[PDB]
Design a protein around this nucleic acid. Structure first.
Ligand SMILES: [K+]
Ligand SMILES: [K+]
Ligand SMILES: [K+]
Ligand SMILES: [K+]
Ligand SMILES: [K+]
Ligand SMILES: [Mg+2]
Ligand SMILES: [Mg+2]
Ligand SMILES: [Mg+2]
Ligand SMILES: [Mg+2]
Ligand SMILES: [Mg+2]
Ligand SMILES: [Mg+2]
Ligand SMILES: [Mg+2]
Ligand SMILES: [Mg+2]
Ligand SMILES: [Mg+2]
Ligand SMILES: [Mg+2]
Ligand SMILES: [Mg+2]
Ligand SMILES: [Mg+2]
Ligand SMILES: [Mg+2]
Length: 95
RNA sequence: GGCCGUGUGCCUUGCGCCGGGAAACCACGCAAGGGAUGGUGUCAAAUUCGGCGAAACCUAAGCGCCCGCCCGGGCGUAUGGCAACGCCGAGCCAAGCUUCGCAGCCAUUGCACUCCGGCUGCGAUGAAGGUGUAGAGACUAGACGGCACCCACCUAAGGCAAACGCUAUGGUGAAGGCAUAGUCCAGGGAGUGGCGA
RNA sequence: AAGCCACACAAACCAGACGGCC
């Protein structure tokens, strides 16, 4: 459902078949229509497959994303988004 | 096919010894002998281009000595050879392992910020080992080769055990294959000529 | 020398360590 606001957003239930470097392109573009985007972490490991972390410059780019993008059918899959349950290493190196 | 020798290799034994190893055991240097060297399964591909090294055995150009000197000889000797075989640079290689690609199936609904789930199919890599290295060589298999497993034996670091101790992920079970078993062909048997002393 | 290199080729047989003698 929902967590507590954070710069980065946890996306899961993605299409596990799509390649690492390819999925980042489909993410950086599709989520930039809210604001500036930092980095995107995608792993293919048994634990991290079908999951991706998208980092925004501000909560404003993130809050709108979570709402306007929740359920957004990505590669025939109901893209599920949550707020990050722990601050990203990228951001914590500034705060 | 037999014996008799010679060298080189091999293992065993003894003796030595900066060594690696927890130990067994390997490694190294030598001398002497030939008594012993487990089993099943699996791979068969690359097989190229160069270079170094070499004992016995073959021969004596030059050199030394001798036949008092010439001519001829004679004796010695490899720096000339044949060659068992020790190797190096680069390339290449089947199956099996190291790590990455691509495809499929299995599972996975998973919160990460360093990298990572399994297998099967080709693609490429890395460590072995091989190829190079047969009488010019050509092709077939397999083993003495590569790989996996089993067995006998030694050892017991670690792991286990309160403890006598237990137990291989450690070792030992030769080298040959610089052509092994085969078919074939070059070579000698058995020609002429050249280079060469 | 020993060997090595060319073309030529008859057989058993010997040849993929060397020297003997069968
Ligand atoms: K011998
Ligand atoms: K020692
Ligand atoms: K060889
Ligand atoms: K022990
Ligand atoms: K030979
Ligand atoms: Mg014997
Ligand atoms: Mg073949
Ligand atoms: Mg060959
Ligand atoms: Mg003379
Ligand atoms: Mg004279
Ligand atoms: Mg002599
Ligand atoms: Mg010589
Ligand atoms: Mg060669
Ligand atoms: Mg022994
Ligand atoms: Mg061979
Ligand atoms: Mg041989
Ligand atoms: Mg043979
Ligand atoms: Mg002849």
């Amino acid at each position: 459902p929902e967590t507590r606001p954070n710069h980065t957003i946890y996306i899961n239930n993605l299409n596990e078949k799509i390649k690492k470097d390819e999925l980042k392109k489909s993410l950086h573009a599709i989520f930039s229509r809210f604001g500036q985007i930092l980095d995107i972490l995608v792993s293919r490991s048994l634990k991290m497959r079908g999951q991706a972390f998208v980092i925004f410059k501000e909560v404003s780019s993130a809050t709108n994303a979570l709402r306007s993008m929740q359920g957004f059918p990505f590669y025939d899959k109901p893209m599920r988004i949550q707020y990050a349950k722990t601050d990203s290493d990228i951001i914590a190196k500034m705060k």
